[PDB]
Design a protein around this nucleic acid. Structure first.
Ligand SMILES: Nc1ccn([C@@H]2O[C@H](COP(=O)(O)OP(=O)(O)OP(=O)(O)O)C[C@H]2O)c(=O)n1
Ligand SMILES: Nc1ccn([C@@H]2O[C@H](COP(=O)(O)OP(=O)(O)OP(=O)(O)O)C[C@H]2O)c(=O)n1
Ligand SMILES: Nc1ccn([C@@H]2O[C@H](COP(=O)(O)OP(=O)(O)OP(=O)(O)O)C[C@H]2O)c(=O)n1
Ligand SMILES: [Mn+2]
Ligand SMILES: [Mn+2]
Length: 1264
RNA sequence: GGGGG
RNA sequence: UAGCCCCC
């Protein structure tokens, strides 16, 4: 460690709280990181005096592996395939030798790539050559699922840990996290690699590059080493930063060693991934003596997902695990995969926890951080053949006799059907009618928003559409000469803009291109990039599904994103007396087929939508005639609406199936079109659709089936007390059945077990295999809960991991920084040990802050000052002679955050600056007599500040665009959007109205007329950048670094005029013995103190924020937050109502709605959060898990502590100031380490009035 | 672009 | 060729 100490000495102390941070030391540390050679990191690793406890037997078979050749074969269709041995799952990358297939690299003679000879033979068509190429390309792919070379993360860890234990400012003692000599993962990493390199001078087992992966030419290297090493590094970092129990961590290493010792690392990982969760989380408290859990009340209406904390629920034996024991299956699993030693140890330790508390949840969390974090990989061919093959077993089909004769592509489900489909059909029919009945549905704007949803910069099987169209002699415009990417639905929209639906209808049946996605702890999933006409025609399906979800059930719309996964719901559901069943449906997409679901859904919508859609087109789709054969004998023609025409065309596609075009670039010669009946993922209907069926069937079970299939009084009573509107929350195929508890305790476990078994049997009737789980735990949207405590899963957030489905190279340097910041933010949300995490993050950041640049032998270097990271959100450890660790990771981002940390030490800074020569006679309002301008330019604080705000990726705008084709394109886009003259007429009105009442007040008027331009830009910025555009990006960053400044942004200079007084610590908002988030306990002072004093966010963040906008949606391309900001700004700038009415007309509203919302906005008392947007202030993401609403309202006093001040008084017409002022106070409170404190407005330099004018100038100048 | 179903 | 839905 002397190697590390010498090279990063001063920097190490700067990030350990011992010495101040300085850009000079930081940049040198950066240069040192870049000058360190890979092999040096290993040499550094050798310098570590590892303890015996950090060692464990390493399997010799991890090095000696068979040839890959017996693991593959050519199938009947000539595709290269993986040959199974351990089951139908054994389709991943096998653990084999690989050096025999490599050619030494010219220069790195010890490293090699796949023999060019072998690929050439493979390309010629040689079976053996193809097999070898496939293996080589997929093994390479497996090794690319990381963000950057492992050595960088390791070096970072060495540098960070060289600082020793950290002194907690709050607890006033050093932490007791074992040093690296006790880190088993690192030891293994060094040994495994050393053993591989053997006598070779090169210590790296492989090199992650841009030109591709290269393997160390050693007979001991295996295709399984990259994944193994990647798991070890994560575990190594986590043991030091999450303060994980070392003994547990070793268990995680053993599993990984076993995975590398097996015949397939990924496969083995997939089969054993439940070990830690099953033997801890799902086995906790078989016995229970005490502890406390939350006591929440679910407010009304439950749909708001709003809860209120009511105290603590004392625990006792009464609440011990009552759910069935998983011991047997868990042990069988361990025995089957050679891990019974691990399962047994976990089972034993889990039993020792008889109290539910911080210690016990941290144990679970720790255990669950040890699961491999690799993104499983297998060839595309394998994913497609495993996911689009299995078909649902409909044990009780809809009788053929129950369908009427056809009505085009659909058949009505006779109302005399005794089938359970009866209910599924009624729900979709009902919702279809109500949806189509809504007036908004027939508003040109609404239909523009819908037509604009799928017009995006992402793909849409562009090539297949062009050819399915060529098949009927219809050639689309090619716009020869435009600098935009052609494979975008945006390009598609422009091509189709001026063609009648009848000419593009065939495209609805065009093939579907391949799209893949790798996941952690899961298998790769195939994706279907539907084309514009396919997405268009899917509208009715999507809208009806949305209507069901918004009006008929209890569901959360989104994908996930911590807190957006409604944390509050899990706390409630998992807290005794309450209990929850974690319902999930396997093979969801493959279970939604025409045989039972789609034929019914298509029918119900087609019919229920009839009367209100009659005699009318929809979203560009015309009405038409179709053959009618409903009645027997009677055969006529039937007029249907455009909406019906859509269902008509969509039904034709759902019936036939999807032609998936598979071009497997990892498997030479594996080109085939696979037909499948599995439901599309890339469809706008997918998510909402599955959510709707989920609740609909659960409703039917609880209302009909269940009751009719049992006479058991308790079960009948239990089911009767459950409602899909009050007790069942779902999204897609995930479900959470919440059984509220009584004073008599919780509902009988045996009665619950009966209900579940019936649900299970119930789904077999229509092809659904319910994955039900009753284990005393709550699991929803990959969020884990036990006894009201959230258990972060560190396993799913691989520090070094990064999904990479395609072969394309990683984005140019700059890009990596956003990823590193994301790694930091995940740690904040996962609750790692704040100091250890912050210090490590500074090391990591520093190690990626420098890049070598080229301009033609013009070898320079791009360096980001430490200050850029602060701007991005990374808190300072110690600066300007301040105490160490005074800054919390809840410090805001950007200007708000800069304001916060600077205000907390304004005086320290001023004093430091003067005592170091930065003095002047001019007395600064913020920094007194400190020559701040000279200081900030020299320290690179201004530089870093501005560099952080520059594009971290090449720009394509400015590419020579031949004006004529450029106008044709944007015209096509315009016609697509402005199809309906009514809409256009609306915007033109807003326009001339704007010139009279709004023009001049603000300069950011959002307008539908901009969309075509924003769409063009999007298609542009989607294309591959050139090396020139790259240089241009660097030059920009480098010019900002050279330039010298005299101030911060106009908004930051304005906030700095405001001063506060931090006062009394707040009282606890929740009980301090209450486990809310594992890892967030008295051992993690700042996070814990913030959680306790500020309080947890007990409402859904989606619901909360939906109340901070006047309009929820708008045409894709415009920014809802932008529209909201313009309206409020106009109001704040004294604009007349007619001006807001004009703004609203320009974004598509009818004059009546426009005038109404405008008049409504004028007289409204706007909330803190919504109002703060007038100046671009947003609630920080890191704050989302806390009760920031309460902080703004009751703990940021705008009235000075000692009464009113002339400067602090808020002018009559400037009440909007209070919202901005609330954010600034909150900033300082949240940025200060420790307990949330009450803060009092102390001063505003030039007074409130002048502050307001200052903000009003910023407002009216945006976009000039 | 980032983090997540 | 590389989809859809969400927090900044
Ligand atoms: N990028 C993504 C990720 C997920 N999904 C959707 O999420 C839904 C279900 O999620 P999973 O549980 O992850 O998919 P399953 O096929 O059901 O996996 P298996 O039963 O193992 O869980 C269906 C799928 O289309 C999606 O459209 N796009
Ligand atoms: N002032 C410097 C010089 C080099 N590098 C880093 O070095 C790496 C590759 O170049 P080297 O071959 O390692 O640089 P050398 O200067 O030739 O090595 P040193 O003096 O020991 O010889 C990439 C580049 O960013 C750097 O960050 N800053
Ligand atoms: N913004 C960037 C990114 C990369 N390059 C050029 O790309 C070439 C090699 O790519 P890298 O592998 O990304 O650069 P290295 O210095 O070899 O190391 P890495 O980015 O970790 O620093 C050399 C470098 O000048 C550049 O000029 N400007
Ligand atoms: Mn599922
Ligand atoms: Mn699921």
């Amino acid at each position: 460690s002397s190697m590390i100490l010498t090279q990063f000495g001063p920097f190490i102390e700067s990030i350990s709280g011992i010495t101040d941070q300085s850009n000079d030391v930081f940049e040198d540390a950066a240069k040192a990181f870049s000058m360190f050679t890979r092999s040096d990191v290993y040499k550094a690793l050798d310098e570590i005096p590892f303890s015996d406890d950090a060692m464990l037997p390493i399997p010799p078979t991890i090095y000696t592996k068979p040839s890959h050749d017996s693991y593959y074969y050519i199938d009947a269709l000539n595709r290269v395939r993986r040959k199974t041995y351990q089951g139908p799952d054994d389709v991943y990358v096998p653990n084999c030798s690989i050096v025999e297939l490599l050619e030494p690299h010219e220069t790195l003679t010890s490293y090699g790539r796949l023999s060019e000879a072998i690929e050439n033979r493979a390309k010629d068509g040689d079976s053996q050559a193809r097999i070898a190429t496939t293996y080589g390309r997929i093994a390479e792919s497996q090794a690319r699922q990381i963000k950057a070379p492992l050595e960088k993360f390791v070096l970072a860890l060495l540098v960070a840990e060289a600082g020793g234990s950290l002194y907690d400012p709050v607890l006033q003692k050093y932490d007791e996290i074992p040093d690296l000599s006790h880190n088993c993962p690192l030891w293994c990493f060094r040994e495994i690699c050393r053993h591989i390199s053997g006598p070779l001078p090169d210590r790296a087992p492989y090199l992650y590059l841009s030109a591709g992966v290269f393997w160390l030419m050693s007979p001991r290297m295996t295709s399984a080493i990259p994944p193994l090493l990647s798991d070890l590094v994560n575990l190594a970092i986590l043991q030091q930063t999450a303060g994980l129990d070392p003994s547990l961590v070793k268990l995680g290493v053993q599993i990984c060693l076993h995975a590398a010792a097996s015949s397939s690392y990924s496969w083995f990982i997939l089969k054993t991934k439940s070990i830690f969760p099953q033997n801890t989380l799902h086995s906790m408290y078989e016995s229970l003596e005490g502890g406390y859990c939350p006591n929440l009340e679910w407010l009304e209406p439950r749909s708001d997902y709003k809860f209120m904390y009511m105290g603590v629920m004392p625990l006792s034996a009464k609440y011990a695990r009552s759910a069935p024991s998983n011991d047997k299956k868990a042990r069988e699993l361990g025995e089957k995969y050679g891990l019974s030693s691990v399962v047994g140890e976990l089972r034993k330790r889990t039993k020792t926890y008889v109290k539910h508390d911080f210690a016990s949840v941290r144990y679970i969390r720790d255990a669950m951080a040890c699961t491999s974090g690799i993104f499983l990989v297998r060839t595309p061919t394998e994913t497609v053949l495993q996911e689009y093959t299995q078909s649902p077993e409909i044990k009780v089909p809809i009788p053929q006799k129950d369908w009427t004769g056809p009505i085009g592509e659909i058949r009505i489900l006779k109302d005399t059907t005794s089938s359970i489909a009866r209910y599924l059909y009624r729900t979709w029919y009902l919702a279809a009618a109500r949806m189509a009945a809504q007036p908004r549905t027939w508003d040109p704007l609404f239909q523009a928003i819908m037509r604009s949803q799928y017009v995006t910069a992402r793909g849409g099987s562009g090539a297949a559409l062009r050819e399915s169209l060529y098949a009927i002699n219809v050639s689309l415009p090619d716009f020869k000469g435009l600098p935009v990417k052609a494979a975008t639905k945006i390009f598609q929209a422009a091509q189709l803009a001026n063609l009648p639906f009848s000419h593009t209808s065939v495209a609805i049946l065009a093939d579907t291109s391949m799209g893949l996605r790798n996941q952690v702890q899961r298998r790769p999933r195939s994706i279907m990039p539907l084309n514009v006409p396919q997405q268009q025609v899917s509208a009715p399906h999507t809208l009806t599904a949305d209507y069901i979800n918004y009006h008929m059930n209890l569901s959360p719309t989104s994908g996930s994103a911590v807190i957006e996964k409604v944390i509050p719901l899990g706390v409630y559901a998992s807290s005794p007396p309450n209990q929850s069943i974690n319902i999930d449906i396997s093979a969801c997409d493959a279970s939604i087929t025409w045989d039972f679901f789609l034929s019914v859904i298509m029918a119900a919508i087609h019919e229920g939508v009839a009367s209100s859609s009659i005699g009318k087109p929809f979203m560009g789709v015309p009405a038409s005639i179709v053959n009618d054969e409903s009645v027997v004998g009677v055969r006529a023609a039937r007029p249907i609406s455009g909406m019906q025409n859509m269902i008509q065309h969509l039904s034709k596609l759902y019936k036939r199936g999807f032609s998936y075009r598979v071009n497997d670039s990892f498997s030479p010669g594996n080109d085939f079109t696979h037909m499948t009946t599995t439901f599309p993922s890339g469809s706008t209907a997918t998510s909402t659709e599955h959510t709707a069926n989920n609740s609909t069937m659960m409703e039917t079970f609880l209302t009909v089936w269940g009751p009719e299939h049992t006479d058991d009084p308790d079960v009948l009573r239990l089911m009767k007390s459950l409602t899909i509107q009050r007790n069942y929350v779902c999204q897609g195929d995930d479900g959470l059945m919440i059984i509220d508890g009584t004073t008599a305790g919780k509902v009988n476990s045996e009665t619950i077990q009966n209900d579940l078994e019936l649900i299970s049997k119930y789904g077999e009737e229509f092809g659904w295999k319910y994955d039900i789980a009753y284990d005393g735990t709550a699991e929803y949207l990959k969020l884990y809960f036990i006894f009201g405590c959230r258990i972060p899963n560190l396993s799913r957030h691989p520090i070094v991991g990064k999904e990479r489905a395609n072969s394309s190279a990683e984005e140019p340097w700059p890009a990596i920084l956003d990823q590193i910041m994301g790694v930091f933010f995940n740690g904040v949300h996962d609750g790692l040990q704040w100091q250890r995490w912050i210090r490590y993050s500074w090391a990591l950041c520093c190690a990626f802050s420098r890049q070598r640049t080229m301009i033609g032998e013009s070898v320079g270097y791009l360096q980001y000052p430490m200050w850029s990271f602060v701007y991005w959100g990374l808190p300072l450890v110690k600066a300007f002679g301040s105490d160490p660790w005074i800054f919390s990771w809840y410090m805001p981002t950007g200007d708000l955050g800069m304001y916060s940390w600077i205000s907390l030490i304004r005086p320290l800074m001023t004093r430091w600056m003067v005592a170091n020569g930065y003095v002047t006679d001019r007395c600064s309002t913020v920094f007194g007599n400190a020559d701040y301008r000279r200081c900030f330019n020299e320290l690179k604080l201004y530089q870093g500040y501005y560099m952080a705000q520059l594009p971290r990726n090449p720009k394509k705008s400015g590419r020579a665009a031949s004006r004529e084709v450029r106008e044709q394109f944007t015209q096509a886009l315009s016609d697509y959007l402005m199809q309906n003259p009514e809409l256009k007429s609306r915007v033109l009105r807003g326009r001339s109205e704007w010139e009279k009442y709004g023009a001049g007040i603000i300069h950011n008027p959002p307008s539908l007329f901009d969309v075509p331009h924003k769409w063009y830009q999007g298609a542009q910025e989607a294309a591959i950048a050139t090396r020139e555009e790259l240089a241009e990006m660097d030059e920009t960053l480098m010019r900002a670094r050279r330039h010298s400044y005299s101030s911060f942004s106009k908004l930051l200079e304005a906030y700095l005029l405001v001063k506060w007084r931090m006062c009394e610590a707040r009282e606890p908002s929740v009980d301090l013995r209450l486990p809310l988030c594992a890892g967030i306990d008295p051992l993690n002072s700042d996070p814990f103190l913030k959680m306790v004093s500020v309080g947890p966010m007990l409402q859904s963040t989606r619901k909360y924020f939906a109340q901070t906008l006047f309009m929820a949606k708008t045409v894709s391309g415009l920014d809802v937050n932008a529209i909201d900001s313009a309206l409020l700004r106009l109001r704040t700038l004294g604009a007349d109502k007619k001006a807001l009415t004009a703004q609203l007309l320009m974004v598509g509203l009818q004059e009546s709605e426009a005038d109404a919302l405008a008049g409504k906005i004028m007289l409204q008392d706007v909330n803190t959060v919504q109002l703060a947007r007038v100046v671009n202030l947003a609630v920080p993401d890191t704050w989302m898990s806390l009760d920031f609403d309460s902080m703004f309202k009751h703990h940021v006093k705008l009235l000075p502590k000692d009464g009113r001040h002339l400067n602090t008084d808020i002018p009559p017409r400037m009440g909007w100031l209070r919202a901005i002022l609330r954010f600034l106070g909150a900033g300082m409170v949240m940025t200060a380490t420790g307990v949330a404190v009450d803060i009092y407005l102390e001063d505003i330099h030039g007074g409130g009035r002048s502050l307001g004018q200052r903000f009003m100038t910023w407002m009216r100048q945006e976009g000039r």
